[PDB]
From Swiss-Prot, chain E:
It comes from the Bacteria. Keywords: DNA-directed RNA polymerase, Nucleotidyltransferase, Transcription, Transferase. PANTHER family: DNA-DIRECTED RNA POLYMERASE SUBUNIT OMEGA. NCBIfam families: rpoZ (TIGR00690). The gene is rpoZ. Promotes RNA polymerase (RNAP) assembly. Latches the N- and C-terminal regions of the beta' subunit thereby facilitating its interaction with the beta and alpha subunits. The RNAP catalytic core consists of 2 alpha, 1 beta, 1 beta' and 1 omega subunit. When a sigma factor is associated with the core the holoenzyme is formed, which can initiate transcription. The rRNA transcription and antitermination complex (rrnTAC) consists of RNAP, NusA, NusB, NusE (rpsJ), NusG, SubB, ribosomal protein S4, DNA and precursor rRNA; S4 is more flexible than other subunits. It is an enzyme of class 2 (transferase). GO terms for molecular function: bacterial-type RNA polymerase core enzyme binding; DNA binding; DNA-directed RNA polymerase activity. One of its GO terms (biological process) is cellular response to cell envelope stress. It holds the Pfam family RNA_pol_Rpb6. This is DNA-directed RNA polymerase subunit omega. It catalyses: RNA(n) + a ribonucleoside 5'-triphosphate = RNA(n+1) + diphosphate. Its EC number is 2.7.7.6.
From Swiss-Prot, chain H:
Acetylated on Lys-292 and Lys-293 in the presence of glucose. PatZ controls acetylation of Lys-293 but not of Lys-292. The N-terminal domain is essential for RNAP assembly and basal transcription, whereas the C-terminal domain is involved in interaction with transcriptional regulators (such as CRP) and with upstream promoter elements. Keywords: Acetylation, ADP-ribosylation, DNA-directed RNA polymerase, Nucleotidyltransferase, Transcription, Transferase. SMART domains: RPOLD. DNA-dependent RNA polymerase (RNAP) catalyzes the transcription of DNA into RNA using the four ribonucleoside triphosphates as substrates. This subunit plays an important role in subunit assembly since its dimerization is the first step in the sequential assembly of subunits to form the holoenzyme. This is DNA-directed RNA polymerase subunit alpha. The modification ADP-ribosylarginine is found at R260.
Length: 51, 51, 316, 51, 90, 313, 51, 310
């Protein structure tokens, strides 16, 4: 699959299993990691043009 | 037998591709031959009949 | 027939090893996926430059060190192997490191007054400790192709390389890093299509605004692949040997011919003239030292027997 | 790679070359260490003089 | 047929006597090359053994009809003297 | 201690024992394996089939001797692979998911060559085995007698043992996320990119306005096989979807369309195969179970179903 | 997600009536390419790849 | 180089709607690139023609009825968004569909209100039941080669549309599957190399044996991003593949042919002149399609490069 960034996704893991696992920290690390790594990807672009 | 302790069985069955007639040719489960003398080494007599 | 092949578009140079061409307008989604194709080519299979082979002034293997340096050779060579450059005649140059005397050892201690652009004139290798101490080597360098480490042939790679002739990590590929990004179309006719953005960064062997076609060819020359529909293939041609009458059951001894011919036809393994009677003349140009004169002897020494060249048969 | 034996047999050629592979490291490093050491110690004497 | 195989059970009504009939064809190919009456479509000897009851004919159970009668129509020819042989038991 | 407790010959060397022509490795999902099949790495096929190679080179001339052949067999050289199609093209590999407390923990298949070091496992039997993908394993056994191969196809084959021995629902069955795909193809929505709308053609997911939740309606003439073998023809208006209509490609059309006019979760889907087993025949019921697998994989992803912070109202 | 490992394998020469035992490369016509990589003492070189 | 001008040699038809479709040889696994990058092109901006808007003698709204139909009216919304065609010309054409008396409603009940071919006869629409029954409609059709939603056309969506003019998206292409696998090439000696496989399937209107040979070269519209983005063609080669006349290995194309006759012949795996020598006028037909000018008289110019039959 690919994002609303127009860019593919390195890994895919089944959420239909998750309600039997009874745990949600795995979703919250995934969403907070999207902020945490997204900071670094935006830095890779910004370091070029600098502005 | 032909995939285990029966040395006769496994050594023929391996080569029964060269016969073309890939068949069983067993001889004696050696783990039962062993047991027929372990039982006699405890002191219990054990032997066979025909049909 | 309604091709589009678009051209001309954009420029944003940043620093020699990175520039930033971008593409708009694009049709309804093209920019969202296409940047994943070159993610193979600009890693695996590219030409560019690398070191191919090395020979050193007292170091038979890189797994070691030399009594006078201040740094140690395996984990030095891991950094030396990245020295990749550009070359302007034939593909190869056997460069030299020429170094002696106290201090650092660098890309400025290397032979560079010829067909070569050492774009890495700030690379550093190690130190030396006295005004008469040395470190020196021959260094084969090509433009080459691929991402080849120092063991890739994997057998016939025990090979007999004279003890100190190092095979090297010939990683010719001038990029591993390539990726892309996207916008909406912003060409001031529109706000209603898509837009591709490139983030290529390199081995320093080139810049992203310097050259490209061979680096996109395993995507451009993948198009003739669907049309113009004639193709390519090779045969089997021989028979299983051999019986009477003993006109064919004879080695080259029977021919009355010269000695260099009898050495190279021996290497070419033609120990029965029963097949020299039928092998094509162009198919004798298949082992060296077998040239314009020995290839010309064949043309009557076979006939001298009362025989001929060019006599294929349905049973041998 | 290693070779070992009852000690009265001094060690085999493939270990005796590896002796000089390990000796190279210490033979070099101690020739740096002696300089690194006195470049501190005599720099303290040098500082007491500069005072 | 390799592509699913239980239909050869429902073809007959039982499942292990099935394997005895299959083996009766199988050994006569693997140790005798005995004549077929349908092709193989790459169902190699393991499953040519099952083909014989996907149809229901080409083990020796119909050679017991065919080749065993080629003898007995000589016994019919020759019946004119099989009387003298059967009289000549006495 | 050769007899009385656990370690004795009876249990350690007789009623179970160590066995040749065998192996184990980590389970992996194999969604392109057809129901009669299993995937096996080339060098594992080489190891498991050495008696066919060190046993046929000397029977075709494809090596000068079994001694010289060391250079060619361990190499996986070309001449190995005629020697192995002569097996693979009709050969039932046995597979195992110990501890085998129930029959379906062991079944029979057919090789497919692959990369890697794993064992590749057909998705409908992953349910029948209870396969648990945490780096647990399965085991492999090659049958080599003509008789063992005959009975493996007749008695142990996946296609030939589909049902629960306790009652008779399928356990060789449309499995873990396959059935969300089938449920998704058979759910319907308001607005729906098609609140009522129809089309054929998968390429119309690329025409601008379609959904598998779009609410099709169609008269479909539909049939039902009697116990005598005749066909009780029927016809009805329907209230349905594009995914419910695509399933009329896959459904064995001797049972009527109206059975698909629902939502095919695990609650329901087994009973379609069960009804096929009660009425049509074995091959029709196998094809209807097998072809539903790839039908699930074409559409399970396109459901976009997730777990996330506003999936938690 | 390529991982890197370091693992160990070993051998012996027993106390014979003389004292030593043999260690060399002679295994003729059994797998010759799997021999090409060795010391005089029948041992691989530090830095060579093996598989 | 091993981008060996890798033509579509191995197609294998399955009958006038589906072929195997394969591309060879490829760079040590490169069917993994092509089978997912180019397969997205084959789903983006493609040809064909189909229904786009409709005007019917009762469907003034969808909640309506027509005592004599069997769909009543609402189950007519089944094969419109479903009927497809080809078209010679410009991107708007028209049909009508005019069934009278008892029957289905079918191609045999159409009338051609514009330039429209109809490679979909089997696309039955609805029914009628009485000796005095009737139904009639207009149909709008378009070809283009790209997609937009029926209610996000946005500028051309504010025209005069009567209370009965039904509205559809850009339905212009009838394909029903496209697959994907990767295994070894045929190329009988150059064998370190793979093939892409794609197993496409339709509804008739095109076999994947037609819908490839310019339908894939839409790649000529995806390359501005990569192969001279600007104005700077540089000295570097194409480095080729020759194998010469009249070698016994040469393709059937080296008899000089007549449109996709070349594709549908080589799809029988008779790709090469060497075995075409067997095809005497007693058992010649085994091939797909290959129906006319090709089949007629080329058998005497076959004997001018120099082959023969008997």
């Amino acid at each position: 699959p690919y994002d609303e960034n127009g860019t593919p996704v390195d890994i895919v893991l089944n959420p239909l299993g998750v309600p039997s696992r009874m745990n949600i920290g795995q979703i919250l690390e995934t969403h907070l990691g999207m902020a945490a790594k997204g900071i670094g990807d935006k830095i890779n672009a910004m370091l070029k043009q600098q502005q | 037998t032909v995939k285990s302790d029966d040395v006769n069985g496994r050594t023929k069955m391996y080569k029964n591709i060269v016969d073309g007639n890939h068949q069983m040719e067993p001889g004696m489960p050696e783990s039962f031959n062993v047991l027929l003398k372990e039982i006699r080494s405890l002191g219990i007599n054990i032997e066979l009949e025909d049909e | 027939t309604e091709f589009l092949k678009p051209r001309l578009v954009d420029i944003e140079q940043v620093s020699s090893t990175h520039a930033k061409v971008t593409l708009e307008p694009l049709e309804r989604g093209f920019g969202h996926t296409l940047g994943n194709a070159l993610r193979r080519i600009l890693l695996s299979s590219m030409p560019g430059c690398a070191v191919t082979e090395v020979e050193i002034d007292g170091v038979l293997h890189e797994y070691s060190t030399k009594e006078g340096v201040q740094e140690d050779i395996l984990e030095i060579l891991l950094n030396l192997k990245g020295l990749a450059v550009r070359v302007q005649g034939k593909d190869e140059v056997i460069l030299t490191l020429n170094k002696s005397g106290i201090g650092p050892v660098t890309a400025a201690d290397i032979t560079h007054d010829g067909d070569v652009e050492i774009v890495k004139p700030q690379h550093v290798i190690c130190h030396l400790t006295d005004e008469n101490a040395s470190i020196s080597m021959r260094i084969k360098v090509q433009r080459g192709r691929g991402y080849v480490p120092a063991s890739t042939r994997i057998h016939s790679e025990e090979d007999e390389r004279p003890i100190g002739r190092l095979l090297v990590d010939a990683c010719y590929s001038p990029v591993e890093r390539i990726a892309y990004n996207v916008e909406a179309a912003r060409v001031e006719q529109r706000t209603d299509l898509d837009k591709l953005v490139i983030e290529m960064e390199t081995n320093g062997t080139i810049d992203p605004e310097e050259a490209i076609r061979r680096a996109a060819t395993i995507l451009a020359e993948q198009l003739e692949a669907f049309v113009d529909l004639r193709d390519v293939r090779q045969p089997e041609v021989k028979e299983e040997k051999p019986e009477f009458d003993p006109i064919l059951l004879r080695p080259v001894d029977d021919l009355e011919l010269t000695v260099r011919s009898a050495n190279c036809l021996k290497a070419e393994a033609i120990h029965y003239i029963g097949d020299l009677v039928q092998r094509t003349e162009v198919e004798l140009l298949k082992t060296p030292n077998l040239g314009k004169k020995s290839l010309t002897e064949i043309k009557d020494v076979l006939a001298s027997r009362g025989l001929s060249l060019g006599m294929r048969l349905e049973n041998w | 790679v290693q070779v070992f034996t009852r000690d009265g047999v001094e060690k085999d050629k493939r270990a005796l070359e590896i002796e000089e592979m390990q000796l190279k490291q210490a033979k070099k490093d101690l020739s740096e260490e002696l300089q690194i050491l006195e470049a501190g110690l005599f720099s303290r004497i040098r500082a007491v003089l500069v005072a | 047929a390799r592509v699913t195989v239980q239909d050869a059970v429902e073809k007959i009504g039982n499942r292990f006597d099935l394997v005895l009939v299959a083996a009766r064809r199988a050994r006569q190919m693997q140790v005798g090359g005995k004549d077929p009456l349908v092709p193989e479509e790459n169902d190699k000897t393991t499953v040519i053994a099952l083909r014989e009851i996907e149809e229901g004919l080409i083990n020796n159970q119909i050679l017991d009809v065919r080749e065993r009668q080629e003898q007995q129509e000589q016994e019919a020819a020759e019946l004119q003297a099989v009387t003298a042989i059967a009289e000549g038991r006495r | 201690d050769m007899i009385k407790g656990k370690q004795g010959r009876f249990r350690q060397n007789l009623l179970g024992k160590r066995v040749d022509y065998s192996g184990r490795s980590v389970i992996t999902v194999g969604p392109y394996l057809r129901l009669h099949q299993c995937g096996l790495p080339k060098k594992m096929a080489l190891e498991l089939f050495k008696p066919f190679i060190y046993g046929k080179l000397e029977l075709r001339g494809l090596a000068t001797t079994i001694k010289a052949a060391k250079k060619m067999v361990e190499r996986e050289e070309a001449v190995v692979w005629d020697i192995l199609d002569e097996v693979i093209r009709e050969h039932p590999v046995l597979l195992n998911r110990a501890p085998t407390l129930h029959r379906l923990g062991i079944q029979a298949f057919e090789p497919v060559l692959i990369e890697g070091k794993a064992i590749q496992l057909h998705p409908l039997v992953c349910a029948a085995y209870n396969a648990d993908f945490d780096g647990d394993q399965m085991a492999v056994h090659v049958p080599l007698t003509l008789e063992a191969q005959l009975e493996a196809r007749a008695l142990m084959m996946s296609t030939n043992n589909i049902l629960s021995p306790a009652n008779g629902e399928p356990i060789i069955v449309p499995s873990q996320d396959v059935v969300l795909g089938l449920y998704y193809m058979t759910r319907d929505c308001v607005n729906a990119k098609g609140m009522v709308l129809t089309g054929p053609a998968e390429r119309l997911y690329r025409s601008g306005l379609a959904s598998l939740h779009a609410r099709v309606k169609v008269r479909i003439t539909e049939y039902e096989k009697d116990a005598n073998g005749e066909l009780v023809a029927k016809t009805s208006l329907k209230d349905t979807t594009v995914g419910r209509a695509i399933l009329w490609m896959i459904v064995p059309k001797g049972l009527p369309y109206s059975i698909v006019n629902q939502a095919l979760g695990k609650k329901a889907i087994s009973k379609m195969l069960n009804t096929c087993y009660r009425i049509l025949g074995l091959k029709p019921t196998v094809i209807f179970a097998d072809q539903i697998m790839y039908t699930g994989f074409a559409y399970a992803a396109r459901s976009g179903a997730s777990v996330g912070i506003d999936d938690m109202v | 997600f390529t991982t890197i490992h370091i693992q160990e394998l070993a051998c012996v020469s027993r106390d014979t009536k003389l004292g030593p035992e043999e260690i060399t490369a002679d295994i003729p016509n059994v797998g010759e390419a799997a021999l090409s990589k060795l010391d005089e003492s029948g041992i691989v070189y530090i830095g060579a790849e093996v598989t």
